[PDB]
Design an enzyme around this catalytic site. Structure first.
Site, PDB file in Angstrom:
ATOM      1  CB  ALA A  45      -0.898  -0.012   1.212  1.00 19.41           C
TER       2      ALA A  45
ATOM      3  CD  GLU B 134       4.741  28.066  10.150  1.00 23.00           C
ATOM      4  OE1 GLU B 134       4.007  27.747   9.238  1.00 23.00           O
ATOM      5  OE2 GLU B 134       5.112  29.201  10.362  1.00 23.00           O
TER       6      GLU B 134
HETATM    7  N1  LIG Z   1      -5.996   2.714   0.235  1.00 20.62           N
HETATM    8  C1  LIG Z   1      -5.368   1.588   0.042  1.00 20.62           C
HETATM    9  N2  LIG Z   1      -5.464   0.598   0.927  1.00 20.62           N
HETATM   10  C2  LIG Z   1      -4.741  -0.514   0.574  1.00 20.62           C
HETATM   11  C3  LIG Z   1      -3.962  -0.696  -0.572  1.00 20.62           C
HETATM   12  N3  LIG Z   1      -3.391  -1.945  -0.590  1.00 20.62           N
HETATM   13  C4  LIG Z   1      -3.814  -2.511   0.507  1.00 20.62           C
HETATM   14  N4  LIG Z   1      -4.629  -1.703   1.262  1.00 20.62           N
HETATM   15  C5  LIG Z   1      -5.269  -2.036   2.545  1.00 20.62           C
HETATM   16  O1  LIG Z   1      -4.231  -2.323   3.497  1.00 20.62           O
HETATM   17  C6  LIG Z   1      -4.464  -3.624   4.098  1.00 20.62           C
HETATM   18  C7  LIG Z   1      -3.658  -4.676   3.401  1.00 20.62           C
HETATM   19  O2  LIG Z   1      -2.346  -4.882   3.893  1.00 20.62           O
HETATM   20  P1  LIG Z   1      -1.535  -6.058   3.077  1.00 20.62           P
HETATM   21  O3  LIG Z   1      -1.413  -5.722   1.647  1.00 20.62           O
HETATM   22  O4  LIG Z   1      -2.228  -7.343   3.385  1.00 20.62           O
HETATM   23  O5  LIG Z   1      -0.177  -6.093   3.771  1.00 20.62           O
HETATM   24  P2  LIG Z   1       1.033  -5.164   3.857  1.00 20.62           P
HETATM   25  O6  LIG Z   1       0.651  -4.188   4.957  1.00 20.62           O
HETATM   26  O7  LIG Z   1       1.438  -4.630   2.562  1.00 20.62           O
HETATM   27  O8  LIG Z   1       2.231  -6.096   4.499  1.00 20.62           O
HETATM   28  P3  LIG Z   1       2.256  -7.754   4.562  1.00 20.62           P
HETATM   29  O9  LIG Z   1       1.126  -8.295   5.429  1.00 20.62           O
HETATM   30  O10 LIG Z   1       3.524  -8.322   5.212  1.00 20.62           O
HETATM   31  O11 LIG Z   1       2.113  -8.161   3.110  1.00 20.62           O
HETATM   32  C8  LIG Z   1      -5.928  -3.925   3.877  1.00 20.62           C
HETATM   33  O12 LIG Z   1      -6.692  -3.372   4.923  1.00 20.62           O
HETATM   34  C9  LIG Z   1      -6.185  -3.269   2.528  1.00 20.62           C
HETATM   35  O13 LIG Z   1      -7.568  -2.917   2.426  1.00 20.62           O
HETATM   36  C10 LIG Z   1      -3.879   0.350  -1.490  1.00 20.62           C
HETATM   37  O14 LIG Z   1      -3.231   0.356  -2.536  1.00 20.62           O
HETATM   38  N5  LIG Z   1      -4.617   1.492  -1.108  1.00 20.62           N
END
Ligand SMILES: Nc1nc2c(ncn2[C@@H]2O[C@H](COP(=O)(O)OP(=O)(O)OP(=O)(O)O)[C@@H](O)[C@H]2O)c(=O)[nH]1
Ligand SMILES: CC(=O)O[C@H]1C(=O)[C@@]2(C)[C@H]([C@H](OC(=O)c3ccccc3)[C@]3(O)C[C@H](OC(=O)[C@H](O)[C@@H](NC(=O)c4ccccc4)c4ccccc4)C(C)=C1C3(C)C)[C@]1(OC(C)=O)CO[C@@H]1C[C@@H]2O
Ligand SMILES: CC(=O)O[C@H]1C(=O)[C@@]2(C)[C@H]([C@H](OC(=O)c3ccccc3)[C@]3(O)C[C@H](OC(=O)[C@H](O)[C@@H](NC(=O)c4ccccc4)c4ccccc4)C(C)=C1C3(C)C)[C@]1(OC(C)=O)CO[C@@H]1C[C@@H]2O
Ligand SMILES: Nc1nc2c(ncn2[C@@H]2O[C@H](COP(=O)(O)OP(=O)(O)OP(=O)(O)O)[C@@H](O)[C@H]2O)c(=O)[nH]1
Ligand SMILES: Nc1nc2c(ncn2[C@@H]2O[C@H](COP(=O)(O)OP(=O)(O)O)[C@@H](O)[C@H]2O)c(=O)[nH]1
Ligand SMILES: Nc1nc2c(ncn2[C@@H]2O[C@H](COP(=O)(O)OP(=O)(O)O)[C@@H](O)[C@H]2O)c(=O)[nH]1
Ligand SMILES: [Mg+2]
Ligand SMILES: [Mg+2]
Lengths: 428, 426, 428, 426
Positions: free
Chosen positions: C11, C243
């Protein structure tokens, strides 16, 4: 204004292969010898052909054969191309005495003739490995003889130090113990080079996952040329090698400088690049860029010299020095305060067609005395003792007339060598 | 840097028949002598192996020794016989008859005097002798019997030259003679004492290579000896040719032997592969090391996982990186250091030769010296004791003039030899 | 004048993909790095190529692989592109310790080098999800280490908060409980972002019935750039991020600002459009435009900051503020009276080719501290307790060496976090 | 991130025959080895499944195990056999004969030592092992017997790698052997204990898919195993390929298992459709979820409306919106939350892979772990008790050396296993 480069042993010659290539690079020297226009390493004939002032020694024809059948064979003269026939067998005893003694008279005379052909002999520099026979033993023989004849000329040695982990011969630690002692005794300076550290650099900094000695030696040579070629050429802060002796060794038994090189950048990396003096010198203090596998961290520092090429300004250098002082983690000894010599050569850093390093605009090397070196010797010391405990392989030297006490003695000399760093590091 | 090759006995001649073929091909030399190759290598280092006669002729620097012409006659009669000069066919009639006493002690000695005269004549023509190589079978009367006489006399003449020999270790499956291990013991007694190094060859293991790993069906001695010659040439060609870690044999030996009396080798060849595999196997240094390390590619019936390695030589042929080789070498020692000697921290010696093999891109050979070797000596001693107790067939040797205490002495020395491996085995 | 952006987790990197796109948008930065003419996010080389000052961390190569095979790969350097190999498996224990600990040294050094390459480091901003492994756990590890080394620099975090209803992993609430605590402890500010609220915005305000993360992150990035890019660029009321720290957090443990964005208008909608400062700021106080599914109504408000782009005049802004005061339904705490910082950047709001938002002439975001946030944490709290009651999934962390009390402890820290809003909202 | 695939027994080899075919097509790899595909995907993630040999050859990282060559010979003889190297055909003669005791306890163990040697050799060539996959039948002597030995030894060597296996659940309609559920129980006893996850495959249900939903007429094992392989590849290809919610299997498993001993899976494939339907069916995520949710598409004879779901995995392939997926996922949980576990509020895990399937625009697979699974275990225990009481056929195993209390212990463990589902069933 002249100096002579001696290449003994395979490694010495293979580095030499890169060295003369590099000097051709430095001036655009044609195979025939054309070169206009630098006579520190070459001597000129009336034909307009300049030839190197260097000696290559190999007791088996094979390596020199490659030289005589390679490029640049027009530049080299048979006088310099010393070939034996038979082998020194990986043992100091033959290298130093049995075999080497037969050839050394030839070799010495050839050196003497070249010395007589020089004008303003500064001294000489020898490339060799610490662990071999010829590379060590023959070298040893030679250095003793050269210390007799050319008493006051510079005696620089460039010694490859076996990686603690990779070794190609079981008696290397046995040979190196004999070597080291004598080397010290007659040398003014010996460089240690650790193949594994260089491999690590090649894969990590240069990103080359298939290094050979030919490319490893390209790196080494580049560094060496920046150390020496450049020092005789003119710069902004033109420093000489004899000045480095004066300014490099604080102790009579000084002397084992460590050099690092830090702009060692892959072409791709270099796109992004911007390495300022400050940035480069930070890289010089990284363990990763050491050239010897040791770790600066735990030693003390005594002299630190910085050698610059290309786009460098003193003020900015001084600022970089201040940064170094700030960043310290450099456990400098209290004996010396601030003793960091800088030399700056206007001439830009060069790049070899065929190399894999990007063109840099500025280049800095670091020379340093540190106590961390003793650790490398300690590794060896234990290996030596182990072998000697069994007396394994000793018969290869006993049949050659060596005495057991000679080897134990040599180890005791190594202990004294370790004690040199103990002494220095110890006191403040 | 010349090498003298002496082939002796039924097998030495037969093995060498394949060896020289290989070498001739290696250098582009026609069966009738002339050179038609195209590399500098092929020309420049002929030296070692061939004498250049006018007319572009090259003659193998080797002598074929036996007390019967039979084998040598078949070689002369067939292909490549024409490359040998008449002077290399030194033989009498009759043979020994598989009798070491007759070979060594009586009858073949008479021939040996003429053999060595020819050897001497060759040594006079030599420019720079590096050493001598003998090919023979441990349990053979002319191979080993006469061979051991030759060895003792050559070393006498040339103490500083490399004395090496390749010998066939009597296999459990193939006895000929009842006293085949007797002959072996008698020769061992001298071989150990008079050579600098010897190679252990076990036919049974070679067959195992042939079929188990190569899945070939019918091994002949020629196919098996082809395999052997691949390793022989593996060893020495790099001596001859330029490389990066040239490992002269002498140097190698230096490095291989921690103790004067243990000079036995365990060769293995690496790019052993079936034809099928060709289409499936990647060739890397780690691949080669996998086959080098694996005990199933050993040319002698000794298991290196049972014994401990004193030294390992790693011969490489071709343009490999030093990193790749060094790292993989290290990796092997990292994995199974437990099968290596304790007092040497780096028990593996690399030797990389720049020059590629013909055809293969990469090639490698394993040479080791391990305590596992003692197993074959034990087999010998085992059989010997049975034989000795009941002097079976000994009367034949007694007739020749061999004493029971003489054999006993030889046994003792065999026992010593085994104990020497025990001393470093642990 | 510089800051560094760190993208951890999928993410984090996917948002980063939008972020550098946006910075290229902001100045017309070519893939090669041309860009004239802004060096808050980029550093310049002498080639004229500017590169971002950002770090991407993914412990599986896959995401970074997409970066290295995507557009802009000329702009990014491998230094910034951190890839591991193997997986952290959705668990804080490996993310923080087992796996992360192996890679973090690399990562930290790369950050340190970039920090040394900055001139005027303001601090850093990190994008991650609250619920993952790497995104949380590794992130956590990193933040601790960064708080040690860069003690006084800004520590902004942008954390995606799992939607109460949509979840993709069962141990997300377990991971988030560990995370949260540590985050708080080392952060200066953490943004929470709720994917479901953003989806709702996409379909309702942008009218997009098929949002993906790539477009969701476009929204987020646009907002973030208005928050930061813009703040360093000059405006009418140029406010800095430090700030904002000073002016955003009233309490030592402050700090969880909520941002809204409100001109989030579809192209079609924009035809009709006229959104004045007053109109936009009304939209900012709508629950529908929150970015986190919470409901402002029932919390109390403490700081409210408004960040402006383009066509804005202070007088009219003040009038809009008066409108807000009038329209109140804004339960402001009695602790603070009137504390509503405005920052106004002359630079017009930007639009991304590829986006679906209409070009607006003025843009305003709202930052706010509210107690309503605790509700989100309460939802989590119950989920956590449920899992922990069964000890479901715990073995995935126990085998990794975690202690049960550690998880119960972390929950108790969450209780304290909820208590922070209790405290603040409670007293007046 | 390599995956080791071991196929074992008549069926494991037969199933894997279809699996590798599928994979090869997935990556554009020719039956004789070379790659001719056209996407980056096809190349870049081969890694996992194939070793690249020179010449553009790719070799399946897999071993075919049996005590008879028969099945493997037919594979080698026919299409795609050429992609396998000789080294992957590890077999003896004679077989077990459907005897678990002989497979596991006696005879196949001997082969297993060589099997694992090859496995080890592959693990040495591996760069980064992710895990292992075995394909076999629960009630089979070599599949499961030998398979369970392999599992116990592999996990020993690699505790941290994913140990997974796909196994065929004995179907009420197809017994072979009388003691088919006996073999299954014996293996279960070890399988549960030694694996991280296992898949439940019931042929009878697969036939139900074939005809009831796909209206196909004559299922062969190849057609049925085609169906299976679609789901196997569904699972792992997304592991391999980039996506949005990458769900490494390990991660998945983490999420799938709340309790260490319950590691059984219920796969189902979603775009199951008859050909007729093709002309009438819209393909949306809700459409896929309709087929995922519907119990009639389960690959094992367990009804998820009877049991309760611990976890549901939802594999997606193709460019779907996150909204569409997330909303529909949620919708399922909104509708029938009663069939889900109480203590987890979100029992369904999405895993969306960006990469589309070949051909289909969208694809999805359901993986679950529900208490409904216990029904198959009950069937086993039911039969077992009959069998055990009268030791029918047990003498055959007794001859091998199996103890009645040993089987009893296994039964107990089966009983435990069932009770474990009861503990969370409610
Ligand atoms: N806004 C947004 N939320 C995201 C995105 N990708 C994942 N999420 C959210 O973040 C969480 C997913 O985390 P994961 O992708 O499973 O894991 P990670 O935090 O990348 O790390 P690992 O568990 O070790 O793979 C979920 O709640 C998803 O809905 C994104 O591109 N945008
Ligand atoms: C089309 C092609 O590439 O054919 C290869 C080949 O298929 C393989 C299988 C060869 C083949 O070798 C054998 O089948 C073999 C037969 C008896 C005993 C031992 C081996 C080959 O015959 C052997 C031959 O070897 C050489 O050319 C080397 O130079 C080798 N030469 C000889 O042994 C030799 C043979 C006949 C006449 C003269 C010399 C050599 C090795 C070490 C030192 C010196 C020379 C090669 C590469 C091949 C063929 C031709 C099929 C292999 O062997 C060698 C020694 O290279 C067997 O496993 C390797 C892998 C090779 O790929
Ligand atoms: C013209 C056209 O669009 O034809 C389709 C087709 O008609 C249908 C009916 C296919 C067809 O599948 C079957 O009929 C089938 C036969 C035995 C067992 C199971 C299924 C198809 O054969 C299967 C084939 O699947 C693939 O290409 C996938 O990549 C699939 N591949 C294989 O299973 C495969 C088959 C042979 C050789 C190598 C691989 C796959 C699925 C998951 C993971 C990896 C690969 C597709 C879309 C079709 C045909 C060709 C008619 C369907 O199946 C799949 C797995 O996609 C059956 O219901 C779906 C819906 C498809 O629309
Ligand atoms: N950097 C570098 N190290 C080398 C090179 N060649 C060899 N070495 C190292 O130097 C040592 C090898 O010495 P040898 O080649 O065995 O011997 P020698 O010193 O040339 O002399 P002899 O033993 O008599 O042959 C080993 O530690 C090698 O790793 C080279 O070209 N470059
Ligand atoms: N590898 C190999 N072994 C051989 C050959 N010929 C005989 N042997 C072995 O040599 C032993 C017999 O000795 P032999 O050579 O006949 O003795 P000699 O001829 O009297 O000296 C047996 O162990 C054989 O296996 C051969 O061509 N190759
Ligand atoms: N799906 C499926 N099941 C199979 C296949 N082959 C055998 N089976 C099932 O496996 C069970 C028999 O075990 P079997 O595989 O013969 O055991 P083994 O070969 O001795 O290990 C029966 O329940 C069969 O339905 C197959 O190719 N596909
Ligand atoms: Mg040498
Ligand atoms: Mg991730």
């Amino acid at each position: 204004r002249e100096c002579i480069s001696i290449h003994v042993g395979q490694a010495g010659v293979q580095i030499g292969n890169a060295c003369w290539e590099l000097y051709c690079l430095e001036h655009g020297i044609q195979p025939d010898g054309q070169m206009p226009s630098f006579n520190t390493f070459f001597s000129e004939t009336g034909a307009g052909k300049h030839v190197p002032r260097a000696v290559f020694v190999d007791l088996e024809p094979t390596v020199i054969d490659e030289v005589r059948t390679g490029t640049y064979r027009q530049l080299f003269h048979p006088e310099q191309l010393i070939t034996g026939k038979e082998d020194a067998a990986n043992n100091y005893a033959r290298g130093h005495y049995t075999i080497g003694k037969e050839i050394i008279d030839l070799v010495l005379d050839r050196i003497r003739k070249l010395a007589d052909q020089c004008t303003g002999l500064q001294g000489f520099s020898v490339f060799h490995s610490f662990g071999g026979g010829t590379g060590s033993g023959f070298t040893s023989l030679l250095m003793e003889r050269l210390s007799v004849d050319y008493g006051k000329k510079s005696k620089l040695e460039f010694s490859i130090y076996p990686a603690p982990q990779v070794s190609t011969a079981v008696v290397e630690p046995y040979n190196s113990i004999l070597t080291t002692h004598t080397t010290l005794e007659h040398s003014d300076c010996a460089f240690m080079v650790d193949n594994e550290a260089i491999y690590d650099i090649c894969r990590r900094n240069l990103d080359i996952e298939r290094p050979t000695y030919t490319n490893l030696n390209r790196l080494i040579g580049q560094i060496v040329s920046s150390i020496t070629a450049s020092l005789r050429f003119d710069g902004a802060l033109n420093v000489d090698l004899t000045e480095f002796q004066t300014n490099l060794v604080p102790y009579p038994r000084g002397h084992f400088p460590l050099a690092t090189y830090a702009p060692v950048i892959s072409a791709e990396k270099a796109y992004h690049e911007q390495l300022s003096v400050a940035e480069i010198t930070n890289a010089c203090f990284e363990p990763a860029n050491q050239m010897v596998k040791c770790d600066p961290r735990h030693g003390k520092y005594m002299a630190c010299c910085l050698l610059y090429r290309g786009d460098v300004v003193p003020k900015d250098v001084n600022a970089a020095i201040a940064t170094i002082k700030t960043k310290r983690t450099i456990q400098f000894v209290d004996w010396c305060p601030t003793g960091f010599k800088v030399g700056i050569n206007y001439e830009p850093p060069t790049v070899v067609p065929g190399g894999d390093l990007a063109k840099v605009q500025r280049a800095v090397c670091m020379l340093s005395n540190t106590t961390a070196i003793a650790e490398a010797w300690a590794r060896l010391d234990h290996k030596f003792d182990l072998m000697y405990a069994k007396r394994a392989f000793v018969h290869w030297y006993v049949g050659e007339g060596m005495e057991e006490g000679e080897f134990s003695e040599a180890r005791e000399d190594m202990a004294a060598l370790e004690k040199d760093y103990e002494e220095v590091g110890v006191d403040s | 840097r010349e090498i003298v090759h002496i082939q002796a006995g039924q097998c030495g001649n037969q093995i060498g028949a394949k060896f020289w073929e290989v070498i001739s091909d290696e250098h582009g030399i026609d069966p009738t002598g002339s050179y038609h190759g195209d590399s500098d290598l092929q020309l420049e280092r002929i030296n070692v192996y061939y004498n250049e006669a006018a007319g572009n002729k090259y003659v193998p620097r080797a002598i074929l020794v036996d007390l019967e012409p039979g084998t040598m006659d078949s070689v002369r009669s067939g292909p490549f016989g024409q490359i040998f000069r008449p002077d290399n066919f030194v033989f009498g009639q009759s043979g020994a008859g598989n009798n070491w006493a007759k070979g060594h002690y009586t009858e073949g000695a008479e021939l040996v005097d003429s053999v060595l005269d020819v050897v001497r004549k060759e040594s006079e023509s030599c420019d720079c002798l590096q050493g001598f190589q003998l090919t023979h079978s441990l349990g053979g009367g002319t191979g080993s019997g006469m061979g051991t006489l030759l060895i003792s006399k050559i070393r006498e003449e040339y103490p500083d030259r490399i004395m090496n020999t390749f010998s066939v270790v009597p296999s459990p499956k193939v006895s000929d003679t009842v006293v085949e291990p007797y002959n072996a013991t008698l020769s061992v007694h001298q071989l150990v004492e008079n050579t600098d190094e010897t190679y252990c060859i076990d036919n049974e293991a070679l067959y195992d290579i042939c079929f188990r790993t190569l899945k070939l069906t019918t091994p002949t001695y020629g196919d098996l000896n082809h395999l052997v010659s691949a390793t022989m040439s593996g060893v020495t060609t790099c001596l001859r040719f330029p490389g990066q870690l040239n490992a002269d044999l002498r140097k190698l030996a230096v490095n291989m032997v921690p103790f004067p009396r243990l000079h036995f080798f365990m060769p293995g060849f690496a790019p052993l592969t079936s034809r099928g595999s060709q289409q499936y196997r990647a060739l890397t240094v780690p691949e080669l090391t996998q086959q080098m390390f694996d005990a199933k590619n050993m040319m002698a019936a000794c298991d290196p996982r049972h014994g401990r390695y004193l030294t390992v030589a790693a011969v490489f042929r071709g343009r490999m990186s030093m990193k790749e080789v060094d790292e993989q070498m290290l990796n092997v020692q990292n994995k199974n250091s437990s099968y290596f000697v304790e007092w040497i921290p780096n028990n593996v010696k690399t030797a990389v030769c720049d020059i590629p093999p013909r055809g293969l891109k990469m090639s490698a050979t394993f040479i080791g010296n391990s305590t596992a070797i003692q197993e074959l000596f034990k087999r010998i001693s085992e059989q010997f004791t049975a034989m000795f107790r009941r002097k079976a067939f000994l009367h034949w040797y007694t007739g020749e003039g061999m004493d029971e205490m003489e054999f006993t002495e030889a046994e003792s020395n065999m026992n010593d030899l085994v104990s020497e491996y025990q001393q470093y085995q642990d």
